[PDB]
Amino acid sequence: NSVXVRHXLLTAILXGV
């Protein structure tokens, strides 16, 4: 997804449990 791909670090923080 285009936003996802451009935001590796924010994605990692969001994914985290």
Next chain:
Amino acid sequence: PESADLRALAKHLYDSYIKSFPLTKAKARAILTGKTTSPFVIYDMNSLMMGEDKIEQSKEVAIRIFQGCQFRSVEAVQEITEYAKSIPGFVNLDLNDQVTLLKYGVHEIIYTMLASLMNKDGVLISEGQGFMTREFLKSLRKPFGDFMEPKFEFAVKFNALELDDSDLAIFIAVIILSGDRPGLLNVKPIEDIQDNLLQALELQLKLNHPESSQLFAKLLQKMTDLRQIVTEHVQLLQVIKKTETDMSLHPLLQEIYKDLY
């Protein structure tokens, strides 16, 4: 029918805020008003040097302070993201939209939460272990001497509304769930969550501030004001980007700012 559920939502958000944010407004105001039973005061270059270990290479002082504000912002982004993930419905949004909401919302939340740490004379730093004077921040060479002054201006007005942590938990949630951010794929579920948050905020302000008649309307306007603060902030970062060459930018901030406004 929904009022009891809006209070449970309010309580859930407060509990989540307490879990997410080490230094609350309640604790910050106790430090600021001198009612704990300690913060190191930084008001010039000598006190800055002395206080450095209570609160980079050999770059000039203005850049080192700016670098420090960056690492604090990065920590705040992580705390805010943890909080966002406890807003009912947020983790079920498309992940692209979760990223978009944080990308465009996290600076408005940072300025909101910075007001809790500020009075008209300075700002708490390093989880309340230091206090840097507004005059000291104004004394830095241009353009660094101008960075914080709009935030102080905002904070003094915003703090006059006397919001507490419970109020702020819902206010911050409303701002994160903004359906008008650029590039959102699915606005309807965001607006559906935000409408419930807005009803929860109105009820919270009527119960917690019953003497303050149009407090809800005033908070809505503060949401608009925060967007202009963040615009002015990006503008200043452009002036810096050019003139200043000794400027590394933390990767997380790089990511947020890239194609931001």
